[PDB]
Amino acid sequence: WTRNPDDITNEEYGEFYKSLTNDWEDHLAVKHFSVEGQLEFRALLFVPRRAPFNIKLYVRRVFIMDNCEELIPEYLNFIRGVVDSEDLKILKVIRKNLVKKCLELFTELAEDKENYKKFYEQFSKNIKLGIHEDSQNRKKLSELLRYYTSASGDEMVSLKDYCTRMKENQKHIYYITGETKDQVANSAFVERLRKHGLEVIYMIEPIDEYCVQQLKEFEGKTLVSVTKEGLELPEEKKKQEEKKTKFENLCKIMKDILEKKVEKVVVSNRLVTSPCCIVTSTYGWTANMERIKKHLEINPDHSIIETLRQKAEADKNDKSVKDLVILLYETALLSSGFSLEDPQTHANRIYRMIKLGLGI
Amino acid sequence: WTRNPDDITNEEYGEFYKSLTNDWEDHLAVKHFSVEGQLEFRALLFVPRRAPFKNNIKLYVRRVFIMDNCEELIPEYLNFIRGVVDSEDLPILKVIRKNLVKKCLELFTELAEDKENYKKFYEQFSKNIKLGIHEDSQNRKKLSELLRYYTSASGDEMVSLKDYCTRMKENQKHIYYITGETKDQVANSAFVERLRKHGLEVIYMIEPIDEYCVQQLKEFEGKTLVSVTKEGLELPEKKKQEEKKTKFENLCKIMKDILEKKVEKVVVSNRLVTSPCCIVTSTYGWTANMERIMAKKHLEINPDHSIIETLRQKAEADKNDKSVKDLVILLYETALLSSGFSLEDPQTHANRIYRMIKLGLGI
Amino acid sequence: WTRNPDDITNEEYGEFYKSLTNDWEDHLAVKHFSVEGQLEFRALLFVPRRAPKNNIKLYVRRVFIMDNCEELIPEYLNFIRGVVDSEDLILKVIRKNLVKKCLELFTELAEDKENYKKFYEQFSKNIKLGIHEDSQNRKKLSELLRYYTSASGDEMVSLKDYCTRMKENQKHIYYITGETKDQVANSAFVERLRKHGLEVIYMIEPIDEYCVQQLKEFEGKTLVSVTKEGLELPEDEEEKKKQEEKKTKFENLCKIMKDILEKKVEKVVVSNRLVTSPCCIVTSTYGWTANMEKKHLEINPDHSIIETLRQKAEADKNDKSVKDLVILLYETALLSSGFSLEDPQTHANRIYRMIKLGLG
Amino acid sequence: WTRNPDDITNEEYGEFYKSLTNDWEDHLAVKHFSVEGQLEFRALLFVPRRAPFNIKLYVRRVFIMDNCEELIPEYLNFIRGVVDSEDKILKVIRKNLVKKCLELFTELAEDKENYKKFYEQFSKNIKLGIHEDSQNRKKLSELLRYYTSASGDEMVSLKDYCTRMKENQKHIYYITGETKDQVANSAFVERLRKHGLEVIYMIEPIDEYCVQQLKEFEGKTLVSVTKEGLELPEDEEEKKKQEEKKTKFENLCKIMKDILEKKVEKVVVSNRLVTSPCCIVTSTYGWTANMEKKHLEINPDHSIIETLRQKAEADKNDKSVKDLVILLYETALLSSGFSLEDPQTHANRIYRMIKLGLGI
Amino acid sequence: WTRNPDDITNEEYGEFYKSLTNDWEDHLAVKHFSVEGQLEFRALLFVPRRAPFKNNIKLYVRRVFIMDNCEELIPEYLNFIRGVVDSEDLILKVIRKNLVKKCLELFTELAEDKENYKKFYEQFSKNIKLGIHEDSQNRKKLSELLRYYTSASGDEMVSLKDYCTRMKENQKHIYYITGETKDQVANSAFVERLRKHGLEVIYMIEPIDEYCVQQLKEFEGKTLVSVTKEGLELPEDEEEKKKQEEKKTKFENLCKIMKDILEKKVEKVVVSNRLVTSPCCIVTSTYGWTANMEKKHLEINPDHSIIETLRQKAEADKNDKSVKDLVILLYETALLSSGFSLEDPQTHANRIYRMIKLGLGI
């Protein structure tokens, strides 16, 4: 019966919401609507203030059911409220309208720039889960997403904003996943993008890994991970092509040294200060997902790499060159969020180096 | 507490009800009583305003809660009742059920005395009274009095079986009913023509449960209910009839032979006026209506009808005629549709129809 | 053990099968394979002789894990019984191999026409259910369909077979759906096509309705229901001009019948699929056919009833007999075409009147 | 967040308790504390007014679990409330909740009037806890309250039982049985009562169960008065009186043991009888009369037993002496709360005794 | 297969039985039948050798498996039956009716083998009795299967049919007593006079019996009557209701005196027609709770010395203290004897001690 009129007050909605759910605080938002034509039903739906750790079904004002899956998808299982149908699985249509209507509410929630943070803080996970599952609403959900970026400082921003700041000739949305904003932001992988004023999205939640599988483009701009092989930057490929064949020798030398530990050793287009890093194949598991393969990129303009090619052009079968190459690889792994096959040998390799720094 | 005093206000009862059942509206009716001697217990029972859909009466023993659901505390047909039972003894709850049932029936009867507002109760719970007629053998008579039906004499009102009996003719020994899908379906059905013509009142049972309910409702005030869609309909001048039976006796045998194993007998009707014939079913088999919710059929013929009068003249004078064969089967087939059965093979029925049109046209 | 060997007698497979399923007879078919590389597993799968969510047992390193793994085999292949034994703790890759191999097995069965009857009798339902659900396989599946037709008599044929026998002026595959082969082979709908030796596929399973939705064409030819409005058939010029003289000859009668029939029917058109029947009811291009778990009256220009009706109607368009007779044609045509009557009792009273007319 | 303030009116506490439990009346008691340091958490706990025929857990105001089988020990499962925490290691929360409940119960006890309300409903649990909770056994036993032979209609504590003990009284005497009237008037408590030695009347079933772990109270052992060898304060050489009587009836005892064959294990001169001629006590371990083995103590100062001594010695084989001994035995069984292995025989025996008392 | 031939050997049925149910031993009996007309189905039903502790008949349609646990197919009391039903078409209330018909047919055929019926009856008598309670329709056919020890029967269990054959000319009732054991019921106060006169009493000595005789009201039109309820009717109308009518009014005084002393503890005190050697007993009301089940009349023996001399003592002053103590004692021991419990044993004891003091000096 409250489900039945309109211009109910906020306090009235609150009370119904509270008695319905045993919540001690009132609803964060409400969406209250009816449908006409084929099916006729009214829905009253609440967004709770806190994320959980169902909706009641009526036919003509008589209670039918509590737990009814099929009514609303799992990624929207936080929604509480009532659905009162007029009739007697075609309620698949009810599901389609409820999902239309929540999404509308979320969009409405998103227009209040200042207070969306409340909803988003709590339910970003569910939006993300939905991107994965709800193929038909992947676009409209993608517009609800918000991320920290290398341009965004302390604010989380929309992919729409990201696109506004895109360069003339930027075809790709760049992102990185990891544990913390600071870990990814100081990561080797973003050094060069970040130097040239390219914006990288910092995806720092575990779902994020799961979600980017499915989020393949936004506004016709494809997302690419700055931790996978073959980074496309937006002329000066001649500058690049020269460095590639300059270090082709050293690449072939390091690859043979590392044998089965990497698939390739290439010349980087993504490093500034770090000498090298470990990127992964486009289709394999990432370093961030391996918790629960590998190319090694070298920085042509780094001085450790620069003197390594000298040392390795003149004599490849050296004991020091081998040991120096492995060490780079090993530390690069650690740095790219991988774990060592055997840390004790890595340790001993470091003590050898330490001794060479110290006399005898 | 609330289950414990008296001269509680309606508002108090309502708030209690609402909390007990998470209903948004208060109760339609309330019965709050107590029992001495044998067992000691108090009961507060509510009738909701709207029917639901494992009973729902909370059992307490000395103000402490024991059970939410307790089969045996009240029969299934009364399961819409919501309320509390508080016993003082309890470790023989047949004693509780009997008093619970006694008191509801009483409440219902008081409801029935308020003519205007009985409709509210009845609209919602007549299903349950009818179910009880089927189940509760001991209270079958009392439940029968709470029943209400549309009749051929009642127009737009539902009337009681008591009112029905008040208007029975002098020599009428039977209450007549028909079961069907809607009010208009049964009222214009073949089976009430003659009864209706002679001002005999027919109860129109138009809900599915009615079929289940009349299995057990055999009489009311010592008058037996008889369905008007069954064989051997007895009416309240029998020699007028007996002439007509022996006159059309011949035709019946020729028709039955043409119809072979589709009908058991072909008989002369006592129930038709404007219709040439109908399909009545044996006293013991499933009704026609009880198949719309998914034998044996008799075909009754109308002695007074023109079609039958001149199909007799056609069948004395030669019984092997092809068109007489065709005419008999087509009466039988349409008689089936009419009586709410289904055609075994529709395609052949249509070709049968088209053949008879080719004839009513000259071709 | 049994899932490891491979020169294993049919008796040994049958024995395993019965103990696995508590069936009393052996299997109809067996498929026993292994898979290398990506994932390492063995499957041994059985087709039961009688048609009975899924019941494939999952083993890891000869240790029993699960009995009901919903992800292992698609819903439409749930009659498959047997075991998957793996070498390591995704399932999409297993599923992929299970459906590949079943389908392979099914095609091997299809080779032996004698034995494929036994299979298809029991599981054709599932092959159709699959055309509906599993689209990556729809094409392989549709080659396994077999239907009775108007030229197959007592054996079921495939669509490939149906296409070879087509006239090459014929663009469409014809089908009718209904309850029983006898019901459909005799319907007004197939009269003219059957006289022309044009082949109609008889589709006498409830699922066929479900399935023809998805099976929109075969080998570039579109399937057309013979129950639906506007049926196109080989239109020789000698003929399709004959169809226009009749068309206009009964132009007035069609209008007069539409008028009498008011809201019960959408158009009264002159027919092109009737030989001996005076008329039939066709449904609209989309929107429920007669098969229920939109309306056109087509009249037959060469049927004496229709020929006479034209004369009586064009003599006096408001004859109460003409009206009555038209509604009787309509009603009986509803009955033919698989519909129920909105008021049986009125149809009866109409029939009594027609009887009275052909008698005095 | 009612579980947060602490200027809370009882009205507000009650309103919360009712919404939490759907009870009609408010709480009997409320304990509402917080914990600082190790783990941080707040608890709001209620003692309902009527025993049932549990605890909601929130973490940082988020509902996690309604039923958590570790939060509170099983005997305290009547406590209704919420625990809200900062994060099995619920061990530590448990500990605290049981500490604070006992703290509260102790406080309820100090308010003599109202504790009776509490102890009526929950004594059962308190005893159930005596059985299970060894760490809190002593503290729980201080809550216990019993009818005694010196308490009237009032129930009294064990601490109060002890203040009235003679200091030569070593033991705390108890009797378990069905009703107060029944135990108070039993033959077992006759002489203790006469001496003014206090007997605890335990009349609940659980009491049998509880005394199995409640062995002492303030270093004073609990003896059942229903068991063999009762020890009571033996004034100087009153025990030398009890040794004359002992040898006086040494012979009678031997005879009755013979007569009683295997029904009874010993016949002894009682030290617990004033007016009853005899009684059946059970052995130190082995089922008491509360069966949900046997000695027969005779009263050396009862006229029946004194006469029996004379008849029995004059002639140990008299059938009247036999019949009289069996009858004494049987009626003593009935008194002591056992059943007769053959009532119809005992009946017949009585009929002979009646024919004797009358002369036929 | 197995459920479609016939002249299948026993070893075959046995093998099928074992595999179907995981029993180590083969079936005690088997019933394999088929049905036409309404529905068509075949049924293969086994009686196990041992009683177990939902039913389990496997339901097949056209030889494919459908359902293990299928209630409604066979009534609860017949849930020991294991086996298979293969229906040709699928109002399975019909199937149930035939299943039950054919089980009873099998039981009757078992009962025809006097010596070996014991094997079945030992295990399943409970289930038969449960049926008598539940299956109103088959109550008669089921009653024909029951067997009981009777006062006539010594060490054998007899049918009610045989009971009826031995009835005296003028005996209108079948007499029963229910109790814990044969020796207890057989030597009870309540059967003395019936037994003296050659009237057969059925000894019902299992708890289900109490439950069973509620519904088992007659047999061969002869009504069953408990010997522990008020108003026992004997056939003795040998013009000797006058004999009985004498004693009735002869002890009318003593009866009313005893009733006043016994106050609310008995409904009435009457002169008995069922005692020989006992002085009195406690019968219960025709409608209340029996004794054997955890309103009382006190019947008194008009021919017993104790009761003969108490009538003297009662007329010679009713108000006497010892008369009061003696009446309560008879009542009390009568209670224990008739299988009730004493409300307060300590006072019964103290009463006994007083009387013992009389017997002795004191």
Distance of CA A10 to the CA centre of its chain: 36
Number of domains, chain A: 3
- H or E stretch at B204: strand B202-205
How far apart (Å, rounded) are the C-alpha atoms in residues B332 and B322?
16
CATH number at residue B8: 3.30.230.80
- What span, in angstroms and rounded, lies between the C-alpha atoms of D140 and C152? 91
C273 vs C231: CA distance, rounded Å: 8
Residue B86, CA distances (Å) to B23, B33, B59, D350, E278 in order: 22, 11, 6, 46, 46
Are D119 and D211 members of one domain? yes
Q: How was this structure determined?
A: X-ray
In the structure, do chain D and chain C come into contact, i.e. share 3 or more CB pairs under 8 Å? no
**Distance from C-alpha of C28 to C-alpha of C18, rounded to nearest angstrom:** 12
Q: For C51-152, where are the E strands, in sequence order?
A: 55-60, 63-66, 81-86, 148-149
Give the Cα separation of D106 and E20 in Å (integer).
63
Chains sharing 3 or more CB pairs under 8 A with chain E? C, D
Euclidean distance between CA atoms E307 and E290, whole angstroms = 26
Q: For residue B1, how many other CB atoms are within 10 A of its CB?
A: 9
Looking at the structure, tell me whether residues C325 and C213 fall in a common domain.
no
Touching chains B and C? (3+ Cβ pairs < 8 A)? yes
Say whether C299 sits in a helix, a strand or coil: strand
* C-alpha to C-alpha distances, E39 to E78, E89, E90, E93, E102, nearest whole angstrom: 22, 7, 9, 11, 16
Q: Is E224 in a helix, a strand, or coil?
A: strand
SS3 category, D351: helix
The tokens for C217 are 């064409």
Among the listed residues A112, A106, A82, the one whose alpha carbon sits nearest the alpha carbon of residue A20: A82
Distance CA B293, CA A80 (A): 38
Model resolution, angstroms: 3.0
Pick from A76, A152, A146, A153: nearest CA to A117 = A146
C-alpha distances out from residue B22 to B14, B17, B150, D54, E178, Å? 11, 8, 35, 22, 51
Chain C residue nearest residue E61, CA to CA? C52
- Domain final residue pick, E53, E86, E111: E111
* Backbone breaks in chain E after residues (C–N over 2.5 Å): 53, 90, 294
User: Which residues of chain C have a CB within 8 Å of the CB of B349?
Assistant: 332, 335
What CATH number did the domain enclosing E337 receive? Answer: 1.20.120.790
Kindly report the CATH number assigned to the domain that includes residue D220. 3.40.50.11260
Q: Are residues B11 and B40 in the same domain?
A: yes
Instruction: From D187, D204, D226, give the residue that closes a domain.
Output: D226
Give yes or no for a contact between B257 and B263, defined as CB atoms under 8 angstroms apart.
no
- Closest-CA distance of chain B to residue A115, Å: 33
Among C50, C55, C125, the residue to mutate for chain E (most E Cβ within 10 A)? C50
D296 and D260 Cβ atoms separated by less than 8 Å: yes
CA distance C115 to chain E (A): 20
Instruction: Say whether both B236 and B283 belong to one domain.
Output: yes
Please tell me the distance from the alpha carbon of residue D269 to that of residue D272, in angstroms, as a whole number: 9
Residues E210 and E178 in one domain: yes
Least CA distance to D2: which residue of chain A? A24
The one-letter amino acid code at E57 reads I
Q: Do at least 3 CB pairs under 8 Å connect E with D?
A: yes
Question: Judging by beta carbons within 10 Å of its beta carbon (0-12, 13-18, 19+), is residue C88 exposed, middle or buried?
Answer: exposed
Q: Tell me: do B236 and B200 sit in the same domain.
A: no
Neighbours of C272 (CB within 10 A): 20
Are A71 and A94 within 8 A, CB to CB? yes
Domain span holding position D216: 110-226
Who contacts B179 (Cβ-Cβ below 8 Å, separation ≥6)? Answer: B186, B205, B206, B210, B211, B214, B227, B229, B287, B289
Long-range contacts of residues E7-12, Cβ cutoff 8 Å, at least 24 apart? E8/E32
Query: What sign results for the dihedral spanned by CA atoms E161, E165, E170, E174?
Result: negative
* Last-in-domain residue among B71, B86, B112: B112
Same-domain check for residues B346 and B310: yes
Q: Give SS3 for B115.
A: helix
Assess whether B128 and B33 both reside in one domain: no
Q: Which of C101, C94, C99, C111 is nearest to C137 (CA)?
A: C99
**Residues 6+ positions from D148 with CB-CB distance below 8 Å:** D156, D161, D198, D199, D200, D201
A164 membership: H or E segment, kind and range? helix A159-164
All residues of chain E having their beta carbon less than 8 Å from the beta carbon of residue C52 are: 64-65
* E286, two tokens: 């025709």
Looking at the structure, do residues D84 and D139 belong to the same domain, yes or no?
Answer: no
The Cα B233–Cα B177 span in angstroms is 11
- Pick from A53, A78, A123 the residue to mutate for testing the D interface (most D CBs within 10 Å): A53
Asked whether residue D160 falls in the same domain as residue D253, the answer is no
How would you class C172 by CB atoms within 10 Å of its CB: exposed for 0-12, middle for 13-18, buried for 19 or more? middle
The DSSP bridge pattern shows strands D220-224 and D172-176 to be parallel
- Quick one: tokens of A293? 């393969």
Nearest residue to E46 via CA among E25, E29, E64, E34 = E29
* Distance, CA of B327 to CA of B307 (rounded, Å): 10
Q: Which chains touch A (3 or more CB pairs under 8 A)?
A: B, D
CB contact under 8 A, C51 and E65: no
Closest residue in A to D20 (Cα) is: A22
Shared-domain flag, residues D191 and D236:
no
Chain E hits for D344, CB-CB cut-off 8 Å, are 184, 187-189, 337
CA distance A326 to A309: 15
Residue D280 corresponds to which tokens in the numbers above?
């059946």
3 state DSSP class of C278: coil
D18 lies in the same domain as D65: yes
Nearest residue in E to D187, CA atom: E346
Of D34, D35, D30, nearest to D9 (Cα)?
Answer: D30
User: Which residue is it, tokens 């020991």?
Assistant: E80
In DSSP notation, D11-70 reads HHHHHHHHHHHT-SS--SEEEEEEE-SSS-EEEEEEE-SS----EEEEETTEEEES--TT
In chain D, which residue's Cα lies nearest the Cα of A48?
A: D62
Chain E hits for C51, Cβ within 8 Å:
64
Q: Strands D266-269 and D294-298: what pairing?
A: parallel
Among C325, C351, C358, the residue with its CB nearest the CB of B334 is C351
Please tell me the number of Cα atoms within 13 Å of E186 on its side-chain side.
Answer: 12
Two structure tokens written together for E129: 């009795």
